[PDB]
Scaffold this active site. Structure first.
Site, PDB file in Angstrom:
ATOM      1  N   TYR A 106      -6.009   5.461  19.342  1.00 18.53           N
ATOM      2  CA  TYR A 106      -5.580   5.809  18.006  1.00 18.53           C
ATOM      3  C   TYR A 106      -5.411   7.314  17.869  1.00 18.53           C
ATOM      4  CZ  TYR A 106      -5.447   5.936  12.949  1.00 18.53           C
ATOM      5  OH  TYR A 106      -5.081   6.153  11.641  1.00 18.53           O
TER       6      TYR A 106
ATOM      7  N   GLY B  77       0.777  -1.231   0.000  1.00 13.45           N
ATOM      8  CA  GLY B  77       0.000   0.000   0.000  1.00 13.45           C
ATOM      9  C   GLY B  77       0.815   1.291   0.000  1.00 13.45           C
TER      10      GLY B  77
END
Lengths: 248, 248, 248, 248
Positions: free
Chosen positions: C157, C17
């Site tokens: 996160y 990616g």
């Protein structure tokens, strides 16, 4: 116990919606208020009737006009003898039309009312505070988190908002460096329930609000009491957002 | 008055400096406070003495330790029966050392105390508010504008601060999206005159302050009164800076 | 002429990616690359086959591990003799579960991988640059605008993201104050079309993108070429967002 | 090389200093440039002499004037047949005088040149891009990190800067929402060593720069080549700062 005892405040756009909410909180805390509006004499007279003419005054004012600033300052001093707080709350909302189709006149009217007006007010207030309040006071520049329900796509509205935010920082520091104890802060309301809207729209609006409902005018009034009073003597050049998490 | 009537608040690092100023304001406004400290028994005992043991409690607490969070929750419920407010104020300051010279253990200790501690506290407080206060409450994460005099060069200190800032946003949104009325906001003091300000750095510190002087502990206490009370019911996931223009 | 001529770069999470698209641009511009991944030996071997083992090397690496950083540094220097650029790209995603339900071990894992790892890599790269690259180089911390489709509700996160952002600033300043010409910036990808985007959410995701489509791995690669090269010698402690308007 | 092959760019304030640096990098990468300036015919002619009549054109332009925009677009289209990129680089600097002493006319001058001018430019560029570049292009709004050495105390300068930043976001989104592939981004130079840098002021200036030296005009050019080219097709509504750590 009155948190704004003996204070005199000018609140622009102070006869309806959010501004009326601020005025209501200010009067509750013992402040004398001068509420202004460009084209809403009825709202103005009704507010003074509500508050009482011993502690409130209505003055017609177009905040984009330098001359109306001097008019409001003069009327405030004649009535109440001093100026301690200025709340720059008057403003124009956004539109969803394409940037390349925007007439300069419509761009300019927004800059005039939402940005330059704030500068004109700060300057007028600062002079009145040096003259009548021993060079001390508090100025609050109010600008909503969003002007449109969708993406913030309005160039003039956004530009005036970003401008006013930095105007706030620069003004605070400009005064601060010279030892002038006049604070300048900004307040940023999220969606406040001030009128009816079609239910499709209202759903869209409340969809942008994480807490799932609109705030009320006195939610803004409460943070303005803090910023207007001596409780926030060390708060300066800063931004106070009350928006149900809208820009979190 | 009594802007915090019947509210029960936990204030970490609440026996000295900024934390104590918050406690003083909370008690003034009718709150019951549980003040904690890692290594300040004498200070804790003395604060309870001046507030009175009917409205205050001291608990020894290392905020980096999960078990100590349960300890404080347990003691708070035993004494006052509920938890309405958590002020995460405890933490450690920054250092001058070179990034590439920083030991993992030293990095980790700062993360544990200044970032992870706040997550542990939020989690403990949320559970207690759900259990004892009808899933309603207010959590305040306090994080200084600056950990060091000059440039913010401390990687662990900065990381923890930036971390705590976004923790506040995400936590407020995480709760709001499930319809839980527990608000989470952050408060950011500038330089406050307390015993923990390094003497040799005082004059240099003041030169970074636009208003030319340090604030007082109660300056932070006042904005914490607003955010703890229902006056700020629509203030959520937002950042309240009280810093004399330091980051303006 | 090759814009990264003679440069040697380490790129973590570099075999799939976004990380692979950064590697592809770096090789195109004459860089030598060390691509790493925690559990993807097949991807690593395939990337080296594509690039050629004269200009590329694969090393297994868990970026949360201090020992693995020394391993990668040693191997890079053994293969290429120097280290000019580090791209901290490896990381893990967010989850949508309740903050008060989050286990400390699960909080800690995200902070270890998404925040502490970046500190470990910065430190390892700096020592390598001082040793082999005349104390000159460029470090790039990659953290996406969003880890979830909806509201950024993941506290671990979000904290690691906010943490890594300020880490970038502090590290850059920590070095600059000591005259060390090692630059540290951050890159913030919006939604990039790769195999790790959840199939079920691809349509909802695209709705949050103002330009109406996802970007490509090489979009992040291009800005990283700029930052790794001498073209950006005055770009330092800054944030480079490539997101199709995602956070505009 | 030719990273700007076949592209036509308008660069305001492009005959000296930063603007000239952008022009040089653009010409290097194969762009054809129209450089403008309000009162620098000499600088203009020197630039065209340097670049060559075939790839460059100089046009006198007051960026505050709507009519001068139509003139510059017409001239660009007559000379090169199309418009692909606009760099809004022209601007006024700041002053250190007191906010309450500032005349409306002087405030308005700065808003006209540093803010409204950007809007007028964007609007003219967008029309030309729809007309001649198949509705694709790149617009770059340039505004310095600081106008003054000390605290950013200039109310008009700061306001126009904050306004221009938000204008960039809103304009990008206004276009993006309608599927129009014209990107709008802003660039923020720190102190750049140009002809207008006077003695000893240099010391104070460099003291605000963590890397300890001013940047070069081509430092700003290099990032503008990235933003003008197809390498940044997913970078939109974003802010690119090249300032040696100045606002880190």
């Amino acid at each position: 116990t009155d948190r704004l005892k003996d204070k005199v405040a000018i609140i622009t756009g102070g006869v309806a919606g959010i501004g009326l909410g601020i005025a209501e909180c200010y009067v509750r805390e013992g402040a004398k208020v001068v509420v202004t509006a460009n084209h809403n004499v009825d709202g103005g007279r009704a507010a003074v009737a509500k508050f009482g003419d011993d502690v409130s005054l209505f003055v017609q004012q177009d905040v984009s006009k330098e001359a109306d600033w001097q008019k409001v300052i003069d009327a405030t001093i004649a009535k109440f003898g001093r100026v301690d707080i200025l709340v720059n709350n008057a403003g124009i909302g956004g539109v969803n039309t394409a940037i390349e189709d925007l007439d300069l006149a419509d761009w300019q009217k927004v800059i005039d009312v939402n940005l330059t007006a704030n500068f004109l007010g700060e300057k007028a207030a600062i002079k009145a505070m040096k003259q009548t309040a021993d060079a001390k006071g508090s100025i609050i520049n109010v600008s909503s988190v969003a002007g449109l329900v969708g993406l913030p796509i309005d160039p003039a509205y956004s530009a005036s908002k970003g401008g006013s935010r930095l105007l706030t920082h620069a003004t605070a520091l400009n005064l601060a460096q010279r030892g002038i104890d006049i604070r300048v802060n900004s307040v940023h309301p999220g969606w406040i329930d001030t009128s009816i809207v079609p239910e499709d729209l209202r759903k869209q609006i409340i969809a942008t609000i994480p807490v799932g409902h609109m705030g009320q005018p006195q939610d803004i009034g409460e943070v303005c009491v803090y910023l207007g009073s001596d409780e926030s003597r060390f708060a300066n050049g800063a931004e106070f957002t009350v928006d149900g998490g809208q820009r979190a």
